[PDB]
Write a protein that binds this ligand. Structure first.
Ligand SMILES: CCNC(=O)Nc1cc(C)on1
Lengths: 179, 177
């Protein structure tokens, strides 16, 4: 029972994460790179500071990590290996976190209501701020789901402890790279 | 229509994720407590005035001192939470939560929230604290902590029974209006 609830939550929330990053890219970012509208000079050609490497994190989850997690759906005791297999990809959350204060300040000081208007226009419940925190939330949530799997999988579950070790190492290294 | 960003902080032991699921779904999640509560918004009316309440969780961030503050900018109100049956979590209000919230958000209102009210009277819980020479946190302890951190209210609640749960979030909204 419990390992199945956990795996289902891991997958459902991964899909919701991919959906969230997609929505972020195809609205807030697309309005900047599009040339549909005009962009405050304060943020012109600064989409790389606002969005950091969120495109590359999205490509990872959308192209690879959701598809590979899904293949572990009936193997929750083994899913820790998915995080070991793809550990180097998670380094791009270190990049993202480092850039996040610079993103927030530039939005604050220079974007005015440019993103609030896009939000109203598309009828999104989530602000650009709400979307851009999601990689920071997600990267610190995997370790919680792996810890829950350890509470209810056999000692045939070092195909969890190694995974959790990776997913504690990544947020700590992101934390340690902040200024 | 006024939009309110409310960020929930405190130790793992508070049950922050369970608090937000129980509030937003109007039911204790019972069978399975989800680990993920994604950024949430709903229209909720307080004193006749409709308001858009945004709720962010911070579960998973408890060990990442430099990551947690990324969530703090532009917060309208904080819930600083402790478990009424975790004296360690209560002391962490003073030692950990208040300092960083005040450093980053010096003018932002704080509601002090004691969670797990349902367990303050629990024989097994009380006995486990007694074996460590501890007791649950009582109402005047919360009042004294609230006063010290400048909290605008001290509120006690249970996600299990829903006792005081709606009041927490009503008073978070009132702290901003
Ligand atoms: C063990 C059952 N009791 C609870 O978990 N009560 C709670 C949890 C939170 C959060 O607030 N009250």
């Amino acid at each position: 029972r419990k390992k199945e609830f956990i795996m289902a939550e891991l997958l459902q929330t991964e899909k919701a994460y991919v959906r969230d990053l997609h929505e972020c890219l195809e609205t807030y970012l697309w309005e900047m790179t599009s040339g549909v509208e005009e962009i405050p000079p304060g943020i012109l050609n600064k989409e790389h500071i606002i969005f950091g490497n969120i495109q590359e994190i999205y490509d990872f989850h959308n192209n690879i990590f959701l598809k590979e997690l899904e293949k572990y759906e009936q193997l929750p005791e083994d899913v820790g290996h998915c995080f070991v297999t793809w550990a180097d990809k998670f380094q791009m959350y270190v990049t993202y976190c480092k850039n996040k204060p610079d993103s927030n300040q530039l939005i604050l000081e220079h974007a005015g209501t440019f993103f609030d208007e896009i939000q109203q226009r598309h009828g999104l419940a989530n602000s650009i701020s709400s979307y851009l925190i999601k990689p920071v939330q997600r990267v610190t949530k995997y370790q919680l789901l792996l810890k829950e799997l350890l509470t209810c999988c056999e000692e045939g579950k070092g195909e969890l402890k190694d995974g959790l070790e990776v997913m504690l190492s990544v947020p700590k290294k992101a934390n340690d790279a902040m200024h | 229509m006024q939009a309110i960003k409310c960020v929930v902080v405190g130790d793992g032991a508070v049950g922050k994720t369970c608090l937000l699921i129980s509030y937003t779904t109007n039911a204790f999640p019972g069978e399975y407590i989800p680990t993920v509560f994604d950024n949430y918004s709903a229209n909720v009316m307080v004193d006749g005035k409709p308001v858009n309440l945004g709720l962010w969780d911070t579960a998973g961030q408890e060990d990442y001192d430099r990551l947690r503050p990324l969530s703090y900018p532009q917060t309208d109100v904080f819930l600083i939470c402790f478990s009424l049956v975790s004296p360690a979590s209560f002391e962490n209000v003073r030692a950990k939560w208040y300092p960083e919230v005040r450093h980053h958000c010096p003018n932002t209102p704080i509601i002090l929230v004691g969670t797990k009210l349902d367990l303050r009277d629990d024989k097994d819980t009380i006995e486990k604290l007694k074996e460590k020479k501890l007791t649950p946190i009582t109402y005047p302890q919360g009042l004294a902590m609230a006063k010290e951190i400048g909290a605008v209210k001290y509120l006690e609640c249970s996600a299990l029974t829903q006792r005081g749960l709606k009041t927490v979030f009503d008073e978070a909204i009132r702290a901003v209006l």
